[PDB]
Amino acid sequence: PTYRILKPWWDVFMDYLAVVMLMVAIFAGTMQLTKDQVVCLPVLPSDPTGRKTNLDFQQYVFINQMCYHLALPWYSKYFPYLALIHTIILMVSSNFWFKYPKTCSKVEHFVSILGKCFESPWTTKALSELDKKDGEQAKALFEKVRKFRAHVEDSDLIYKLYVVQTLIKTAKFIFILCYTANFVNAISFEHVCKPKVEHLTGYEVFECTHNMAYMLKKLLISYISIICVYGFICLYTLFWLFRIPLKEYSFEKVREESSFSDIPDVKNDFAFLLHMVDQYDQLYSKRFGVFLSEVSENKLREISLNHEW
Amino acid sequence: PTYRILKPWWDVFMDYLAVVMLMVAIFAGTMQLTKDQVVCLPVLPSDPTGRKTNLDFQQYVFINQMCYHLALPWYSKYFPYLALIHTIILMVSSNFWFKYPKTCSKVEHFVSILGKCFESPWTTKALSELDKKDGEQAKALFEKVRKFRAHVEDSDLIYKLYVVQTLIKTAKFIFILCYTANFVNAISFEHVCKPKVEHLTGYEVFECTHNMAYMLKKLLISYISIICVYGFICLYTLFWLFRIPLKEYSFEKVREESSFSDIPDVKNDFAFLLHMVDQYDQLYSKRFGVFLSEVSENKLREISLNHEW
Amino acid sequence: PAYRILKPWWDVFTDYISIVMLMIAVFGGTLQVTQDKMICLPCKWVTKDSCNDSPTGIKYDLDRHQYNYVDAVCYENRLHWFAKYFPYLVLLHTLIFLACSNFWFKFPRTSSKLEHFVSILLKCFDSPWTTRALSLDKKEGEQAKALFEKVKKFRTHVEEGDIVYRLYMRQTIIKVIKFALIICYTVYYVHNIKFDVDCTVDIESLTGYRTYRCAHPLATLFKILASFYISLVIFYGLICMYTLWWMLRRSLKKYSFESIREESSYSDIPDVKNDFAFMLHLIDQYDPLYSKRFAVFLSEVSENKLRQLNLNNEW
Amino acid sequence: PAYRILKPWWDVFTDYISIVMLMIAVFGGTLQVTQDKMICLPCKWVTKDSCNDSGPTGIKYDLDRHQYNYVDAVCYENRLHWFAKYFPYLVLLHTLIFLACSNFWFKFPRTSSKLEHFVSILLKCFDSPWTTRALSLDKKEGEQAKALFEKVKKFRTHVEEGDIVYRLYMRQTIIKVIKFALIICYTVYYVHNIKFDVDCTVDIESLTGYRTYRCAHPLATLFKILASFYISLVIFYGLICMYTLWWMLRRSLKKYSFESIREESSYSDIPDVKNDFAFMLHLIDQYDPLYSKRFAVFLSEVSENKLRQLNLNNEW
Amino acid sequence: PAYRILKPWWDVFTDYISIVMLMIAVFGGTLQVTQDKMICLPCKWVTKDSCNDSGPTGIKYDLDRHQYNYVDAVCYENRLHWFAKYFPYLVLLHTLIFLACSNFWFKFPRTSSKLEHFVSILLKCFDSPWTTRALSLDKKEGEQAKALFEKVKKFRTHVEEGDIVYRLYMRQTIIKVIKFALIICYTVYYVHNIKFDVDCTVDIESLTGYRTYRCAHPLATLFKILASFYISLVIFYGLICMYTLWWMLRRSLKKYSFESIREESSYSDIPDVKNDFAFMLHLIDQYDPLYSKRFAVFLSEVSENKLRQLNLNNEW
Amino acid sequence: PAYRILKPWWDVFTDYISIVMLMIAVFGGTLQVTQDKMICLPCKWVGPTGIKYDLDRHQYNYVDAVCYENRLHWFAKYFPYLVLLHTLIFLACSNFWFKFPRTSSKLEHFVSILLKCFDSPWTTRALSLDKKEGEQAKALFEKVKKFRTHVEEGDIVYRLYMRQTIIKVIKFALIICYTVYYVHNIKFDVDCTVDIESLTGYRTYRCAHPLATLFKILASFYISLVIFYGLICMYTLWWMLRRSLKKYSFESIREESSYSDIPDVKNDFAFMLHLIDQYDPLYSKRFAVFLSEVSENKLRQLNLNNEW
Numbered sequence A, B: 001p002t003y004r005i006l007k008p009w010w011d012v013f014m015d016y017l018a019v020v021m022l023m024v025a026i027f028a029g030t031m032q033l034t035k036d037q038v039v040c041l042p043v044l045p046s047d048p049t050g051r052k053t054n055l056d057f058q059q060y061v062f063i064n065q066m067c068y069h070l071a072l073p074w075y076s077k078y079f080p081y082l083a084l085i086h087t088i089i090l091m092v093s094s095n096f097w098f099k100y101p102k103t104c105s106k107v108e109h110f111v112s113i114l115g116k117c118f119e120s121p122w123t124t125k126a127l128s129e130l131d132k133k134d135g136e137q138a139k140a141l142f143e144k145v146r147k148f149r150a151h152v153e154d155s156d157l158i159y160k161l162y163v164v165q166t167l168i169k170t171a172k173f174i175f176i177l178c179y180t181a182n183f184v185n186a187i188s189f190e191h192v193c194k195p196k197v198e199h200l201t202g203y204e205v206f207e208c209t210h211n212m213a214y215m216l217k218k219l220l221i222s223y224i225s226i227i228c229v230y231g232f233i234c235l236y237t238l239f240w241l242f243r244i245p246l247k248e249y250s251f252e253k254v255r256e257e258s259s260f261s262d263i264p265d266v267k268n269d270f271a272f273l274l275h276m277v278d279q280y281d282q283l284y285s286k287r288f289g290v291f292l293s294e295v296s297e298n299k300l301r302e303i304s305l306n307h308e309w
Numbered sequence C: 001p002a003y004r005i006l007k008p009w010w011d012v013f014t015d016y017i018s019i020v021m022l023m024i025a026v027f028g029g030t031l032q033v034t035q036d037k038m039i040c041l042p043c044k045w046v047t048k049d050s051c052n053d054s055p056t057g058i059k060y061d062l063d064r065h066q067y068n069y070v071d072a073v074c075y076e077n078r079l080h081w082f083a084k085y086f087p088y089l090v091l092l093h094t095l096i097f098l099a100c101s102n103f104w105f106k107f108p109r110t111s112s113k114l115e116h117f118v119s120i121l122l123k124c125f126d127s128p129w130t131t132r133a134l135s136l137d138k139k140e141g142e143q144a145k146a147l148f149e150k151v152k153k154f155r156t157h158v159e160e161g162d163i164v165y166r167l168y169m170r171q172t173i174i175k176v177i178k179f180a181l182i183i184c185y186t187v188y189y190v191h192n193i194k195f196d197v198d199c200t201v202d203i204e205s206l207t208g209y210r211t212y213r214c215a216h217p218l219a220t221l222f223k224i225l226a227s228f229y230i231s232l233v234i235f236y237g238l239i240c241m242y243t244l245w246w247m248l249r250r251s252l253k254k255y256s257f258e259s260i261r262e263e264s265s266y267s268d269i270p271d272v273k274n275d276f277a278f279m280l281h282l283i284d285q286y287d288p289l290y291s292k293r294f295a296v297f298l299s300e301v302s303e304n305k306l307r308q309l310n311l312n313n314e315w
Numbered sequence D, E: 001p002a003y004r005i006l007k008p009w010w011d012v013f014t015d016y017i018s019i020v021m022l023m024i025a026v027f028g029g030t031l032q033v034t035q036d037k038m039i040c041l042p043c044k045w046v047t048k049d050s051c052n053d054s055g056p057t058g059i060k061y062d063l064d065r066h067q068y069n070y071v072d073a074v075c076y077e078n079r080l081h082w083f084a085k086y087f088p089y090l091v092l093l094h095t096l097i098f099l100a101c102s103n104f105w106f107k108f109p110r111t112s113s114k115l116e117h118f119v120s121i122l123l124k125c126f127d128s129p130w131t132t133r134a135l136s137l138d139k140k141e142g143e144q145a146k147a148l149f150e151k152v153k154k155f156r157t158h159v160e161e162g163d164i165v166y167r168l169y170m171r172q173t174i175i176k177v178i179k180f181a182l183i184i185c186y187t188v189y190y191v192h193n194i195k196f197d198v199d200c201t202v203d204i205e206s207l208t209g210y211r212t213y214r215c216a217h218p219l220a221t222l223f224k225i226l227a228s229f230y231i232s233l234v235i236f237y238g239l240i241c242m243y244t245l246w247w248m249l250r251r252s253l254k255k256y257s258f259e260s261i262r263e264e265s266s267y268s269d270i271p272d273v274k275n276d277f278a279f280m281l282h283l284i285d286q287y288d289p290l291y292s293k294r295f296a297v298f299l300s301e302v303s304e305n306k307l308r309q310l311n312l313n314n315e316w
Numbered sequence F: 001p002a003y004r005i006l007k008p009w010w011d012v013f014t015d016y017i018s019i020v021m022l023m024i025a026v027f028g029g030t031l032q033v034t035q036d037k038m039i040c041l042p043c044k045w046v047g048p049t050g051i052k053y054d055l056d057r058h059q060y061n062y063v064d065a066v067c068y069e070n071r072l073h074w075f076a077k078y079f080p081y082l083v084l085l086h087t088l089i090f091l092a093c094s095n096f097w098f099k100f101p102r103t104s105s106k107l108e109h110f111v112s113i114l115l116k117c118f119d120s121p122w123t124t125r126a127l128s129l130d131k132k133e134g135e136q137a138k139a140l141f142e143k144v145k146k147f148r149t150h151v152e153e154g155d156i157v158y159r160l161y162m163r164q165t166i167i168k169v170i171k172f173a174l175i176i177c178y179t180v181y182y183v184h185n186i187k188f189d190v191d192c193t194v195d196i197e198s199l200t201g202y203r204t205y206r207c208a209h210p211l212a213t214l215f216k217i218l219a220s221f222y223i224s225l226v227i228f229y230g231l232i233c234m235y236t237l238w239w240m241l242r243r244s245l246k247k248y249s250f251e252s253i254r255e256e257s258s259y260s261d262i263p264d265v266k267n268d269f270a271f272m273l274h275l276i277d278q279y280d281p282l283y284s285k286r287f288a289v290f291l292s293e294v295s296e297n298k299l300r301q302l303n304l305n306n307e308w
């Protein structure tokens, strides 16, 4: 969909970190349904020889299941699903600002006209300072840009949607870092189980060992590190968003670089898309600036009239 | 198809919720054949030592199967399949209002003529206040939209079908909330069974545990929360349909904005699509409404006369 | 691709039903391969014909492999074959239905005729001459003349043959016969999917017990899948019977152009026959717009007007 | 794709039968790898080579789990018939051989180049408006038609001189039919060995304690059903190949006559092609004769003369 | 894609044999992952150095199930032959090596660029109407033909000097044939060790209580069958590679002669080419001589003179 | 695809070696997650008959789990996960300059301009006239001049490539250090003392690792692949540091071609042209036509001749 122009480097890094987090969550959930198990042995009273517990195989299985659903804490068995939910939430918000239908149509029109301006030779002719069909195409693209300027600059939906998206991402990162970090050392290999099923097996206290505890702890540490990098990138994005006021876009530098100075000050959502493209590459910003100049309009009209006469 | 013009934001959110519920249902069904084992131990009559039940391993598996078939209720066994059926029904009924072939054609050519209005430079000229081929295209589009008005504005089929679809969605949500929340606390971890297999094992009463009980309850709670969000969105849709009478549409603000003030009052279905468009984008509504004014028709006729003479 | 215009609503519904049936077959086959087994416990009281009903656990003194052998033997012998081979029969029926529904799309004669018809319909539907006739350069005129000649060649090539209509009728007949046979045998053999099965396999020389009481864990789920498959077969048969009634209610080998010639400005379009008529009936079932746009090239008056316009714009 | 015109109804039927048999082979191999075991129990009463058959209480054999597993493995390796063990692998090999024999002429470059050139030329002649006008022009269309006439003439003197495609197709049909004969011999002869209950005398008495064991093959009936289905599909494949061979040998496919086409059309001077040209035109006739009738325009000299006259008309 | 013109029949056969061998490697690897194990039973009566053979009742070993698992693991690690354990991994490595040797000149950037340019220019010349006109004029077609003549001349003066492609193909063929020789030596020498019954003496008497155990390898027969089939495929691959090497060394492929073209066609000024261009022309002729014959017209000064004469004729 | 011209032979070799490494990592992870266990038997004393331990099966499973998670070396347990992380790092660093937007836009522009110049017949005419061809040729000349004046000012691509190569080579050094140092710990039989006598009754257990030999073989093959990868990265560093890639020389091209006024390019332009030369010098030679001013003068003269 050629949406990579709109996404800056920090957004690409956030998307790739979300992909890696989703992969980690899926891998953790694969093991949490394949080999997630606890093995429990009863605490018996006091040439070495083994201790006979007088328990059947299925009594041991019953004890294991009961202690898995009672002794094992919720964060030692539900982390991969919470990680999957968090990755889904982060990935949905990542593409949300161009998936909402109004903003999607606006950004699609913006990308289309930006590509048309980039492929327009009239921009190169104006920057360096033709044909009747080329002049007609240039006039049509100028009129399309004129219609687009009134279509987008009136509203501020895209900027507000992006602000809401990054605020939601930052809040989710803060919540994940606050609640996940408190439950790191709480994951332990051994677990003391008191299932109160002595009338079925004969033992009151069972000592269990969660098999998927150390690997789950390493995956938790890796997820915490990745989400910390993600939060740092999101905080940098917030600082950039609140650094430059994106409600307006001064073309003073563009009008100074170019030979045309009749470029209006683009504001609102039209300014936000131009700022994102400038964060991507300033060439398209120069193209739009020279296509928004009235002196270029006068030059194009004069060229068309000279072609006609 | 570009159906997003007539598809409001709440419809897209309902489709997203349906997709998420489908994913939750298939995830539950995946584990419904993975962790569905039911470990059962007999209730035996009254230094610590293990309790000897004198049961073989095959006897234990037989009791497990017997009390999985008997003790576990249907909502603890076939829950994800019912959720899958509900998600399939919701996905089928998501786009019911324009799945009807007559209304499908009406919506398709409505989007076509709206796109023609957007692309036509005569709309831009009217908003500001040309080639003869463009004038003929404008005349053809004027005749086409007049035929559209005379053909669709008389009836109200699409509005009735949309009301039917949203009432069906509301009724389905109410049924799901009533039926499914009745079995929230009914799902229990442990089940006591009396499978009457004393002639095969010697014990009449067995005590069991369901491995996929707490996880199933968590997934049920999440599914009920998502369907509650779906019902809230549906209730907001009903509130938006009832607070504003959609049987008619007035362009009074559009008449005041433009110099032309001969826009008629659109009623019936022709008003429902325009209301949906105005919710999607009021600029498209204005660009269509400047066509319905007879002053624009008179100006087009005057331009045609100037071209002819 | 472009063959979607040849499938009416009943064909699309049968395709969706076959897809759901194939999903059911895959699900049942996965259950059969993975989680299908039996758990049989011997009955020490065999006074009656079946297992007899008669605290501490009962000791059978049987090894694990003796239990496995008993389960395997009572799964092989005293379990009804419908419960064991339910998803395989469903898979075979889905393969037969998919072969029958797509037989004419792969038979070379009917596939070639359908491809030619679809290509000609695509050429005629995008032709500006049809729009002009309903409501212009000499290159467009000669292209329309070539399209008219190709339409005449198609008429004289396919109007004689009747392979497509006969093959479609045979496919519908085979499908409805298969539906009748399935509804007979599946419903007749659906009461044998029991959870509890009593087996008397006479392996006393290897185990020591005569009669065993088994339990089929997937019996209830297979019964639910069998009910779902029966409902799907019933819907499939109703759709196929509607298709057969549509084919036999009126002659599909003859197509009437009275409505089109009355609606349009041309009243000289003759009736087509055989595969041409059948394909036009299928088009009318899908969309009458294609037939209305295509009927322009079946009239000599349209050709006369086209050549008159060509002579007009030439000079 | 573009090669669907070179596959008659028998070729499509063989392709779909091969696909079904390949699915059968994959399913059987998945069952053989995973589910195929052999539950064996010893026989305490022995009166002959086979196992003897003779409140109630269970019989105790005093065998461990691993002794039972060892008995199962040894009686699976020794006294289980090879056809039941390697049934899906043979089916997979036969399906691979059939697919190779069906796609050899499409993958062998000497015949693949000729087939693709013939298909390209036939499709370029089929879409040319000059064929429609001749069966019933612009200077660019006229020179394109002249170039296509020259290309057809160059193609005819290049392919008609050899008969490699016909020889390769005949050899493929012969190999397929003899493969079907060998399969329908050996598979049918050895299909009776897939039985549920097999007795073994594998002589592991020094390890377990018993001489004879009576086993059970859980997948015996399912493998027997799959073998019956594979035999039926092989029978259908062989009948189709017999029809193909009879069609090839009934009339000489290395000699094509346009007598019906030249009688229907005005042109009665169409030459008779031979060898690979004749064989490919026979294949096209078995697919659809419209392509052959449309291609017959470019062989007639009268159409070439008419094209030359039109080129002279539009040249000046 | 369009690279099939550079792959002769032996290259296609080697590619398909490598695909089949890769499938065998994957099947053996998943068998090794899933159900590769040993079932070991101790021998209580040991009179010889190895295990000794000596109503009936089962022999009691008084071993736990995990003791049996430990014995199986130890005798699988120590006294099972390495070939029976790592057979599919060696096959996978050999298939990867063969595929790398086949696609090295496809992926090596200098030879890849040379092949891309050669294929593009050959396909442009094959569709050029000037070839048909010469072997038997629009201004745009004449300009395109002149540009194609210039491009062919530049390609000849750029590629004919270097011999990287022929050298790389020779090195790939030599590496493939010596790899085949090493495989057919070591695999054949080590194929006898894949046997069902394996006797182990691993000295775990302190943990278990017995010294010698009689093990069984359930996958030994299937691994031996797969090894035999892989040896047969390697033999076929080596025969194909030896034929390819004999074809390379039989004639100097760095010297292509157009003697047949200059003897049959009117244009007799076509000079002989050398090095990579000659080798690529030989490969194309092995695929289809029509492409080489159609490409040979651009290497003649007479054809260019006729083209420029026609350009001057239609220019004024 | 279109960006393969910017990948020299060392980049392709590193990509394929990393693909093989990723396959090894996936296979090892599949083995470790599913099949990896540790069968343990207690040491009773720190015709033949079996030794009885009076241990239940679940007691054996508990002992196996405890001695697998306690006294087994960390490298034997987490071998393929480190390999997977290293493969992901190598894949990210190899194509980091294809994902950074500032360098990605320049790479896209360079590839598109190079392809357009290669497909143009004006280069063939110069090395040896429709109005559209001349118009497209002069537009290509103008956009080539714009590309040169836009790219030559900055050297972001060369610095990023140098950083990626340095990161890759130091990662290879770290891998070939730590993996080699921790490769002897993968052994079959590992004794464990976990002090669970209160639960089972034995102190020391003699364990066995079923996948120890296969993990060791995979580690050895991964070490060999890492050695090859490091040798290729060392060659890449030597190629980068042999010549100043910020400056490109057109002396051979201007001497071979008729034009002898081709200026030297700097910064990312020179680095990209060096990469193209390492791929194929024909592309750079054909692109060198649109840099000489004499070619522009000839094109203007031909346009004027077509005008008159």
Ligand SMILES: CCCCCCCC/C=C\CCCCCCCC(=O)OC[C@H](COP(=O)(O)OCCN)OC(=O)CCCCCCC/C=C\CCCCCCCC
Residues within 6 Å of the ligand: A030, A033, A034, B030, B032, B033, B034, B035, B036, B037, B038, B065, B068, C026, C027, C030, C031, C034, C035, C217
């Ligand atoms: C992108 C695709 C991949 C995504 C990631 C996938 C990761 C997992 C992939 C494969 C592993 C599948 C098997 C996992 C088994 C784990 C162990 C386990 O669950 O053991 C218990 C398990 C459950 O028994 P119950 O059903 O409770 O018995 C009830 C009796 N009345 O044991 C058994 O069934 C026996 C062992 C056989 C396998 C069990 C799992 C079967 C899973 C799914 C079956 C349905 C699949 C449907 C889709 C099929 C598509 C071809």
Ligand SMILES: CCCCCCCC/C=C\CCCCCCCC(=O)OC[C@H](COP(=O)(O)OCCN)OC(=O)CCCCCCC/C=C\CCCCCCCC
Residues within 6 Å of the ligand: C025, C026, C029, C030, C033, C034, C035, C036, C037, C091, D025, D026, D027, D028, D029, D030, D033, D034, D035, D088, D089, D092, E030, E031, E034
């Ligand atoms: C000749 C062609 C060969 C083709 C290749 C075949 C071999 C494939 C290679 C490897 C497969 C590895 C599978 C590993 C699975 C996990 C390990 C394991 O041991 O699993 C055992 C586990 C349980 O086995 P049992 O306990 O014996 O089952 C109860 C009855 N005794 O196995 C399974 O769960 C079954 C096997 C794996 C899943 C198979 C799923 C098959 C699904 C569908 C087939 C039927 C429908 C087909 C529809 C087709 C529509 C186009």
Ligand SMILES: CCCCCCCC/C=C\CCCCCCCC(=O)OC[C@H](COP(=O)(O)OCCN)OC(=O)CCCCCCC/C=C\CCCCCCCC
Residues within 6 Å of the ligand: A027, A030, A034, A035, E026, E029, E030, E033, E034, E035, E036, E037, F025, F026, F027, F028, F029, F030, F033, F034, F035, F080, F081, F084
């Ligand atoms: C770190 C990198 C990333 C790792 C990602 C790992 C993803 C894992 C995804 C899915 C697997 C889910 C569990 C599947 C099994 C479920 C049942 C279970 O837990 O165990 C069953 C059972 C346990 O093993 P045993 O049969 O006891 O083995 C006896 C001999 N040692 O599992 C198995 O047998 C194995 C199941 C998986 C088989 C996979 C087969 C294919 C893999 C590798 C073979 C080689 C492929 C080569 C490809 C080359 C391509 C060019």
